[PDB]
Scaffold this active site. Structure first.
Site, PDB file in Angstrom:
ATOM      1  N   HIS A 147      23.568 -28.893  77.015  1.00  0.00           N
ATOM      2  CA  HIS A 147      23.803 -29.442  75.894  1.00  0.00           C
ATOM      3  C   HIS A 147      22.646 -29.726  74.781  1.00  0.00           C
ATOM      4  CE1 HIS A 147      26.832 -31.455  73.168  1.00  0.00           C
ATOM      5  NE2 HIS A 147      26.163 -30.978  72.481  1.00  0.00           N
TER       6      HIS A 147
ATOM      7  N   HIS B  65      20.426 -29.233  71.547  1.00  0.00           N
ATOM      8  CA  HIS B  65      20.216 -28.771  70.027  1.00  0.00           C
ATOM      9  C   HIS B  65      18.697 -28.137  69.743  1.00  0.00           C
ATOM     10  CE1 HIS B  65      24.407 -30.132  68.060  1.00  0.00           C
ATOM     11  NE2 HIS B  65      24.116 -30.728  69.663  1.00  0.00           N
TER      12      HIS B  65
ATOM     13  N   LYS C 287      29.222 -21.375  71.204  1.00  0.00           N
ATOM     14  CA  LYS C 287      29.407 -22.807  70.950  1.00  0.00           C
ATOM     15  C   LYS C 287      30.431 -22.765  69.921  1.00  0.00           C
ATOM     16  CE  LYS C 287      29.502 -27.260  70.565  1.00  0.00           C
ATOM     17  NZ  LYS C 287      28.155 -27.998  70.311  1.00  0.00           N
TER      18      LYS C 287
ATOM     19  N   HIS D 176      32.396 -25.367  67.452  1.00  0.00           N
ATOM     20  CA  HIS D 176      32.333 -26.462  66.841  1.00  0.00           C
ATOM     21  C   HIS D 176      33.109 -26.739  65.554  1.00  0.00           C
ATOM     22  CE1 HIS D 176      29.858 -30.141  65.526  1.00  0.00           C
ATOM     23  NE2 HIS D 176      29.267 -29.896  66.571  1.00  0.00           N
TER      24      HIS D 176
ATOM     25  N   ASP E 130      32.459 -28.421  62.813  1.00  0.00           N
ATOM     26  CA  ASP E 130      31.857 -28.435  61.840  1.00  0.00           C
ATOM     27  C   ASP E 130      31.780 -26.850  61.156  1.00  0.00           C
ATOM     28  OD1 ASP E 130      31.390 -31.115  62.370  1.00  0.00           O
ATOM     29  OD2 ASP E 130      28.990 -30.902  62.325  1.00  0.00           O
TER      30      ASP E 130
ATOM     31  N   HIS F 293      33.750 -28.220  71.285  1.00  0.00           N
ATOM     32  CA  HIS F 293      33.750 -29.451  70.455  1.00  0.00           C
ATOM     33  C   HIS F 293      34.943 -29.344  69.463  1.00  0.00           C
ATOM     34  CE1 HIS F 293      31.479 -32.468  67.627  1.00  0.00           C
ATOM     35  NE2 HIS F 293      32.720 -32.500  67.171  1.00  0.00           N
TER      36      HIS F 293
ATOM     37  N   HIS G  26      31.081 -33.527  75.583  1.00  0.00           N
ATOM     38  CA  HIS G  26      31.359 -34.821  75.250  1.00  0.00           C
ATOM     39  C   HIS G  26      32.958 -35.324  75.369  1.00  0.00           C
ATOM     40  CE1 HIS G  26      32.054 -32.817  71.562  1.00  0.00           C
ATOM     41  NE2 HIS G  26      30.637 -32.795  71.487  1.00  0.00           N
TER      42      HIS G  26
ATOM     43  N   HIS H 248      26.233 -35.377  61.798  1.00  0.00           N
ATOM     44  CA  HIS H 248      27.292 -34.522  61.186  1.00  0.00           C
ATOM     45  C   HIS H 248      27.254 -34.365  59.525  1.00  0.00           C
ATOM     46  CE1 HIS H 248      28.645 -33.379  65.168  1.00  0.00           C
ATOM     47  NE2 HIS H 248      28.882 -34.720  65.329  1.00  0.00           N
TER      48      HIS H 248
ATOM     49  N   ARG I 180      36.636 -42.239  66.156  1.00  0.00           N
ATOM     50  CA  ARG I 180      35.903 -41.428  66.980  1.00  0.00           C
ATOM     51  C   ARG I 180      35.169 -42.553  67.847  1.00  0.00           C
ATOM     52  NH1 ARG I 180      32.076 -36.369  64.899  1.00  0.00           N
ATOM     53  NH2 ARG I 180      30.383 -36.655  66.447  1.00  0.00           N
TER      54      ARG I 180
ATOM     55  N   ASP J 199      22.697 -33.706  74.512  1.00  0.00           N
ATOM     56  CA  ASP J 199      23.315 -33.491  73.082  1.00  0.00           C
ATOM     57  C   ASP J 199      21.964 -34.100  72.346  1.00  0.00           C
ATOM     58  OD1 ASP J 199      24.902 -33.120  71.049  1.00  0.00           O
ATOM     59  OD2 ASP J 199      26.155 -34.815  71.071  1.00  0.00           O
TER      60      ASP J 199
END
Ligand code: NI
Ligand code: NI
Ligand code: NI
Ligand code: NI
Ligand code: NI
Ligand code: NI
Lengths: 566, 100, 101, 566, 566, 100
Positions: A133, A135, A216, A218, A220, A245, A271, A319, A335, A359
């Site tokens: 994980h 980035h 991935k 996601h 977003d 995610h 996560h 985010h 969250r 992450d």
């Protein structure tokens, strides 16, 4: 002759029955087996055993190992044993008894003129960690991760751009090609994830054909049932993994709708507790399913006094959320839940959560995956006592269950276990040497592909390598062409076939992923529990079989202030 | 100045020691890295003053006591080593069991 | 609490069990010290050490692996030897055997 | 017209008859010759001489040099002279008078549009040093050595592993190949040594065929008469050098037995004094033989007040010895002897010891080979006065004798003198520029293969390169492909023939070693004395022709506290 | 619906009519246009617009951009507008409205699965700067320049050698080849200048054929009418640029003689004010001619209280001048004149001087070209008010005039404007993102060839990229092969044809220069004034049309102490 | 010491803060980088002392006032963030509008 056990340990390291404390935690391991023949241990130094005609033989290079780690205490998912480790051609050759067959008995790992020696007596040796994980926000993360003991990094990104700050995605053929080329410069094994959020299959196939080993999904970029189904369909045909995610906002549906879209197809849930993202407030229930490979990101591991306070702001920055925009802040308390954060620790102890990851720089700490995993094991021993699976007065089983979380399970989940993930013959020699007092915190040696890539190093101008200041510095395995030869760039089967490596002129060794669709919860080593778990919509309470699952926040943790300057 | 790589490296040790020094001043029990940096820096200044290797091997054991460091720290440091330019060139000082 | 501490169980380890051994009186006739290693072919040690080389053929010191026995000039002492195993092929040292036995 | 000598020196540097102090030592050199034509010196700058039609000509690149070092004071084994140095194609073109033949007389080094200029007036220029006793424990050693003025590094190792910590050996084909590839990343010329401790010739031949330029025989791997004979037999057939670290324990025999095993064959004896290793207590007697090329490692150079105190512990760490194991400590007072340590300094002054080296991070200081060599010369002048060979009131001969120790002699000993080791035409342009006040301590410029590779550099954003902080930073000659083009990787004749360079895809220039078996003590420049030396078995006293050889320990040394921040 | 302008700015950045202050200066820009459709702006983040089926489309990679910079405020010579920027294949694809044509109106920049996102709302985006007066004294200058916002560096040198300390010349085929190879290691576009001081044409042609894109004529190598004519003749036949540093000493003639030698042929005059070099005291009059492209070096920009005091010593060190030699110091007060230094600032404000550059480490600051250019604009607004060309209550025109000085004009002058220099479609994507409070001082992001090469980066182990310490660190675009793919090495047409790239095995993308002989003063964007300027031989007063041109020295400047730690 | 890259990075923050600290002592109005370094270093020492994240988020707003920094500086720092090892491991402290 005869020698006392204490003097024996001081000379060759502990043996069968001896126990060793892991760093400053309360976890104790006990040597389950010793593959040596007492009195025939190999030791290096002036007047020692490894010398011509004695512990060293007359064989040619092809008949002896390149590197031998003597008197090592192996800690792996399969056992905690004392043995010599042979390394040949950059891969693990054997786990046995090293020496010279000419004068010594039971030699399985031959030492010759072509054999280098690493003295591991008194040290613990483990496989290199695998963080799935990542980035790719900056290249500096690789050094940080390597120093911590992580040798393989899977994730996505193009650098410090908004898309990467928020998601593990290397968007499209051009950026994928660029990152594949940049990867040759990094001292860790690497595999990239593309952006899987699209409802047109060909847009995904291009990315896989370009080189990504996973996709991935996601929120977003839109984690809709349509996008999810699309990514899984392509995943099923190209044998790549999907990392999810989910929709925290419950915009397209609730967790049960996402689960429905998945439709029993294999998928890695990132996560899974939810603080890092996912259907509020019950994404955690996903760990109950057979097709779900669940992992945790590290800032919530383990539950401590400052966890909650810290999370509220960290969420915003990652985010691109606005603290002034009510809607952007209202889903903070939705969250971040003390209830699920506390339950996660227990679910790990039970084997319901099978992986740990970072992450990196997006609600996670790249150099703390191993460190935090052990902190959870410590806190769980302290609070819950011995596991039902323990035998003897040691924490051996709990140690195998937790080490598997950042080694073999991540390897199995992403289809790279045929190359790395554990100390087994034929696997790439990515090993980490630890002094027991610094286990899980600061490695004594980090070996990549059979060459030391990084290690603590003292004054360069000193008469010995030990004088201060001692800090981590790059070694030969991290240099130019030697590096290329000692690292792997994982490709999808399609990319490998398309000649992507030759076209991009990649210099490192190439490995291909396979077996991503066939792995299931039951395949996760020591972590295959599928609990009947529920989350109360109002109270957020987590219950397994109706019983409440929870834990208490730690005020102080081991592997913390005793080891770090800042 | 024409600082060589080794001189710049030692600036890292010096700075690390400034950190420990202040923490000890506040009355904190020092940790592992702080202890090593503090005692190491002490020795380098000793060489600068012109003290002999033999003297420092002794004096270095009286910088920090067992009650000024965190539990387990003394056992994590069976010895401390550092080189510095003495009037007669670079020499190695090894302090065995510095914290008692 | 000591980070990384061992909890060695009490007792002893018997070394090189089930193997032929023999004792030899050895005397250093040289004027300089001689130190011999655990796995060195005793019959091929420094020529200044006087002893029955014929008896020590294919033998090594019966001491823990990696340790040694020092002989100061003029020193006399009885040492215990243990026979080589494996293929029982001696190569190297002073080059007196260079083969099996 | 006319100009006073003082003003002349301030403008063009000293000339014939002028003396210059070496750093803060008591050594004075005197200009023996000046190759210029007074009034025709070339000088660069605004309104100076090197300008179109004036000191710069109209010739094409092929007819002029690429780089000219103007008004340099050369200090080499062959002379201490003032002259311009021409560099073309990365090699030393000429030592003479630079300028434009169109208007100037006696021009031997033509300057044209294609000519770069380095102003050396007032500076001392020397060949780059050569350290033949490197333990490749970490890659950082290369930068440290380069900054000190050493441009070629010969040794062995694979990184921070026990075998390398203790011995200069790159064990086997795989590690040799890996280190040959890693070498392309380093800004110094490199040659590797393999593990020579084996009694089976083919195991050695493989290593030579893999690329090593020598074999290291080390007692830690068993320095037996059998192993020694084996290594020398292969050395004799492959034209590679053998470096020896003999049996300190006298386990297989005494020094006379080792000497017998050698049997008059050429061999380089490492740290011949013994503190760094070798038959206790008389390995030093080896310097009496014609087939022995003797060198010293640096921690014992020169004998000072803190030498002994320091050595006792340094020994332990390097060779993996146990301070609790009596046998591991008893041979400390047998290895560290004030008597031999004191004698070594004198033997160097007399020319009995011909080389100096480091023994990097294994009882030696990588950045102090040059520095310590000059400290010995200083201390010997102070204690013994002028050498019998001196002429005039200067230390010119003593300077030529000592500079040869870390330049030409190491080059001759390892078969690379055809490429480097001295400032002679046709040799690689590895030069070092020194300001007289910092001679031997901190270089003004380090030139590799005709390109500056490292130099002191001030504020990068400053208006000039001189503002603080000024510290050593890598230059263009140390960058990527320019680096490959300016460094050499030495191969054995067999490796070169086998196409090792093409197979490993080595990028740097390749040089091959030759003449390793034919060199003898008599070939060592200014250091060919074969003394009738003896060592008392009991007292350890060193005697030459019956006279006692000894010296006094220094309390303070030059090139020490006046130059270093720490 | 409706949204207030203030809230709109906080969300998407300023729009038409809103003004923004440049850093802490008095310059205000006003948004001239906005290419968006209100309510259809693309924004990235959780629950934002750029998501599957919404702001992101279903198109394949070939049909969408690789990178999109959303809601950017562009400041370029052609306008100050709000728009999205699309980047594809490392080049600027479009300046328009990004989104998904499926559901959004007026989309010109399509976003798909293959699209990465950089959020630029609230930021100012500009082209990368171009410094055409670099002395390659050290490789570290490239990082320093890149961090400041300069993406292309043109100059000459071989490292810290006297010739390079004083002049921008990479002398001859060998050094040119070496520097071309070294250039692949640097994260900036590069073009080299050779030594143009020779009266034999073939010596120049060789250099051009070897790879240089220009020839530097420098007085230190002899700036005679013969040399000048020779360089221009070759320049005219090979389409390369000539950079001049004239005869300060008036040795071969006065400025009018040099101008005569030039004979109306195109030429770039370096530091035209004279402090950095040139006919004393009137080299500044050169800006009156149509064939002269004039530039300033930065230490004299702008005129402040400490300028003069500082210059007297800086001169000496750069050009190897002797403070004791009267003749070497007498021409200090002849070269440093308050009169011309003060006039220069005004001439820039009027457009008589068209370029700004550094003169790196040779009377110039590599990281201050952009910074100082804006300081001059500020001081000129403060002293002279609005320009005759301004419209509205903003400094928009003055901003376009000054930004052109370090972007498009340098590109036009050196024949590389077809590749870089401005934000126009088809040009290499070398962009710089600035937060308004740090404009011109410290960039938020530096993009090279479509990949971020350097950016401020916080704690690598942190949970987000923002925690301290935040400092500039290299990114993926500066790594190995990704770097090669994102940078350009400019070659002369002859070198390109001769296969120089293949022979030297250059790894980076290659660009060729063209149009160097055809550019004239009239082609310099917003800076084409040819004033009737005179300089009084005695008083040094500068007059245009008889009126005195002058300005006052600043005691304090913006973009100074508020931003720097030292 | 076995300093990892993150520990060495923080030594840069510490040293930057020593610079600001001395300047403030002389009575200068601090600039942007000085202000950030000063407040950041304060927080790291707070974690070393064992203070909680919540406490530091508050205390960090009382290190420097608007009258001790240069004009415009408070507005250039809408927040400050730094991580340090607390007794319970690494944690992030975010101080909003530190200078008032
Ligand atoms: Ni996530
Ligand atoms: Ni993430
Ligand atoms: Ni040795
Ligand atoms: Ni050695
Ligand atoms: Ni100039
Ligand atoms: Ni210049």
């Amino acid at each position: 002759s005869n020698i006392s056990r204490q003097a024996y340990a001081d000379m060759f390291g502990p043996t069968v029955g001896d126990k060793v404390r892991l760093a400053d935690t309360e976890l104790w391991i006990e040597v389950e087996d010793d593959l040596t023949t007492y009195g025939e241990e190999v030791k290096f130094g002036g007047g020692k055993v490894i010398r011509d005609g004695m512990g060293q033989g007359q064989m040619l290079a092809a008949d002896c190992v390149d590197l031998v780690l003597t008197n090592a205490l192996i800690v792996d998912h399969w056992g905690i044993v004392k043995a010599d480790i042979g390394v040949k051609d950059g891969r693990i050759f054997a786990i046995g008894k090293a020496g010279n067959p000419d004068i010594q008995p039971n030699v399985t790992i031959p030492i010759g003129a072509a054999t280098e020696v690493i003295a591991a007596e008194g040290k613990i040796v483990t496989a290199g960690g695998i963080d799935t994980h990542i980035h790719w926000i900056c290249p500096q993360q690789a050094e940080e991760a390597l120093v911590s003991g992580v040798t393989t990094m899977v994730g996505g990104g193009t650098g410090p751009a908004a898309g990467t700050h928020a998601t593990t995605c290397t968007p499209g053929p051009w950026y994928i090609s660029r990152m594949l080329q940049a990867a040759d410069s990094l001292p860790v094994n690497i595999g990239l994830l593309g952006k899987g959020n699209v409802s047109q299959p060909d847009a995904l196939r291009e990315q896989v054909a370009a080189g990504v080993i996973g996709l991935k999904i996601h929120e977003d970029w839109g984690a809709t049932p349509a996008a999810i189904d699309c990514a899984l369909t392509v995943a099923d045909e190209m044998d790549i993994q999907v990392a999810l995610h989910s929709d925290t906002l419950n915009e397209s549906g609730f967790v049960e709708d996402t689960l429905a879209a998945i439709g029993g197809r294999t998928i890695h849930t990132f996560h899974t507790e939810g603080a890092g993202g996912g259907h509020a407030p019950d994404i955690i229930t996903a760990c109950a399913h057979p097709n779900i490979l669940p992992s945790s990101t590290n800032p919530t591991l383990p539950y401590t006094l400052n966890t909650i306070d810290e999370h509220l702001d960290m969420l915003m920055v990652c985010h691109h959320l606005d603290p002034d925009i009510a809607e952007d802040v209202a889903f903070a308390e939705s969250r971040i839940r003390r209830e699920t954060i506390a339950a996660e620790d227990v679910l790990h102890d039970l084997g319901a959560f099978s992986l740990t990851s970072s992450d990196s720089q997006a609600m996670g700490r790249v150099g703390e995956v191993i460190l935090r995993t052990w902190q959870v094991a410590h806190r769980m021993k302290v609070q819950r006592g011995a596991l039902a699976e323990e035998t003897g007065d040691n924490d051996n089983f709990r140690v195998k269950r937790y080490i598997a979380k950042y080694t073999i399970n991540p390897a199995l989940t992403h289809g790279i276990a045929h190359e790395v993930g554990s100390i087994e013959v034929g696997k790439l020699a990515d090993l980490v040497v630890w002094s027991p007092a610094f286990f899980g915190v600061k490695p004594a040696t980090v070996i990549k592909g059979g060459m030391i890539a990084i290690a603590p190093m003292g004054d360069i101008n000193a008469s010995i390598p030990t004088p201060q200041p001692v800090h981590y510095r790059p070694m030969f395995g991290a240099l130019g062409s030697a590096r290329h030869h000692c690292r792997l760039t994982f490709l999808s089967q399609a990319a490998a076939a398309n000649g992507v490596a030759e076209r991009l002129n990649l210099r490192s060794a190439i490995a291909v992923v396979k077996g991503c669709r066939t792995v299931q919860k039951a395949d996760m080593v020591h972590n295959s529990l599928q609990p009947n778990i529920t989350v109360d919509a109002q109270t957020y309470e987590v219950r397994v079989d109706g019983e409440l699952i929870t834990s208490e926040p730690a005020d102080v943790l081991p592997m913390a202030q005793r080891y770090f300057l800042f | 100045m024409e600082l060589t790589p080794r001189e710049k490296d030692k600036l890292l040790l010096f700075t690390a020691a400034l950190v420990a020094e202040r923490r000890l001043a506040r009355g904190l029990k020092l940790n592992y890295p702080e202890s090593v940096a503090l005692i190491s820096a002490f020795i380098m200044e000793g060489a600068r003053d012109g003290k002999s290797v033999a003297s420092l091997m002794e004096e270095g054991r009286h910088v920090l006591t067992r009650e000024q460091v965190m539990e387990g720290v003394p056992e994590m440091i069976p010895d401390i080593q550092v080189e510095a330019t003495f009037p007669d060139g670079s020499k190695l000082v090894t302090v065995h069991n510095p914290i008692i | 609490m000591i980070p990384g501490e061992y909890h060695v169980k009490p007792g002893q380890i018997a070394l090189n069990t089930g193997r032929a051994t023999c004792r030899v009186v050895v005397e250093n006739h040289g004027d300089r010290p001689i130190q011999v290693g655990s796995h060195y072919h005793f019959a091929e040690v420094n020529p200044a050490l006087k002893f029955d080389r014929q008896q020590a053929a294919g033998y090594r010191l019966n001491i823990p692996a990696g340790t040694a026995v020092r002989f100061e000039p003029g020193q006399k002492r009885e040492v215990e030897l243990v026979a080589f195993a494996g293929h029982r092929a001696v190569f190297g040292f002073r080059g007196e055997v260079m083969g099996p036995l």
